[PDB]
Amino acid sequence: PTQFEERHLKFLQQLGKGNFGSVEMCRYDPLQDNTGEVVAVKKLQHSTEEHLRDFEREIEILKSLQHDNIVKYKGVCYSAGRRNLKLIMEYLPYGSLRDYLQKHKERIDHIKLLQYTSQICKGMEYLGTKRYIHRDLATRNILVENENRVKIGDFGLTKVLPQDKEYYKVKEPGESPIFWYAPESLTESKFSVASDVWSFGVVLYELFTYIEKSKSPPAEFMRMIGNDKQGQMIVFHLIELLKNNGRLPRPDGCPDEIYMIMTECWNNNVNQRPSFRDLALRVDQIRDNMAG
Ligand SMILES: C[C@@H](O)c1nc2cnc3[nH]ccc3c2n1[C@H]1CC[C@H](C#N)CC1
């Protein structure tokens, strides 16, 4: 059941790319009459030994996850006559939360943003039970299932913690989403549940900006750093800024109690950041206490 035949998998559309993988919208059509289910298919651009090993790990990670706020694993396709590997996931028609919020920003009130926030936290609590570190939380990686439900939608950088170890050092050669990174990820390449909490704070920030371009984390940090800065100078200044309490500003219209949650996530002291369980409870208590 979790093995899809390449001959029945038909390309429809490109969905997106990230890291060293691409995701496409495909019809799985065993009846060969254009009526079959639509699925999302992830492929690697280069099946090097390293990239393929990492992809197999990603597949095992997603397969192991079963939660209402995590995109569903469907299977694998051993394509090119079983000399290639593709990952099959459910396809969510509403797309990413990033694009959804940018489109429906009038429809979506604060209570709804908090509902999405809560759901992201719950998916992350679940990841923590498996000792998985996501390492790439951002609204681009969250999918909308319906107007009332989101799912964490990509796990391309997700790592399993070594047993009883609180962090994983990933000396990555190449680009990184530095404007979502915790300071210790920038300075020591250390990723942990606590660095996911930092990045979650940035996701919460993203939501309350409604993805206004001039308010993005890169736009705001570069404004503080100096828009003229290039290369490593950007990283030097970002690190120095963060170490001495430089932070993203409170978004226009954002309740101060919600900004306080972001600022608590953005603690330089790793062991003082709240847990995802703390965060889900706090966010749901706020929602439950609100005027409506
Ligand atoms: C268009 C893009 O936001 C998108 N729409 C999707 C619908 N269903 C999906 N099922 C799995 C991914 C996925 C989808 N993705 C993105 C999510 C992020 C991913 C990465 N990296 C690229 C595809």
Question: How crowded is the C-beta side of 14, counted as CA atoms within 13 Å?
Answer: 5
167, 205, 210, 268 from 256: Cα distances, Å: 31, 12, 16, 20
Give the residue, by CA position, lying nearest to ligand 1 atom 21: 18
Distance CA 195, CA 178 (A): 12
The full set of domain ranges for the chain reads 1-91, 92-288
Q: How many CA atoms lie within 13 A of 95 on its CB side?
A: 13
How far apart (Å, rounded) are the C-alpha atoms in residues 216 and 202? 10
54 belongs to the catalytic site: no
In angstroms, the CA 256 to CA 177 distance is 26
- Binding-site residues for ATP: 15-23, 42
* Phi-psi category of residue 97: left, alpha or beta, with phi > 0 → left and psi -120 to 50 → alpha: alpha
Does domain 92-288 correspond to CATH entry 1.10.760.10?
A: no
CB 266 within 8 A of CB 247: yes
Q: Among 14, 55, 96, name the best residue to mutate to test ligand 1's pocket (greatest count of ligand atoms within 8 A of Cβ).
A: 96
CATH class of domain segment(s) 1-91: alpha beta
Listed resolution, Å: 1.5
Q: Is 16 in the pocket of ligand 1 (CB under 6 A)?
A: yes
Kindly state if the Cβ of 36 falls inside 6 Å of ligand 1: no
Q: How far apart are CA 265 and CA 248, in angstroms?
A: 12
Experimental method: X-ray
* Alpha carbons 150 and 143: distance in angstroms, whole number: 5
Contacts of residue 18, Cβ cutoff 8 Å, sequence gap at least 6? 136, 140, 141, 154, 156
Residues 6+ apart with CB under 8 A from 151: 68, 69, 70, 71, 92, 119, 123, 142, 143, 145
Chain centroid to CA 26: 22
State in Å: Cα 143 to ligand 1 middle. Answer: 7
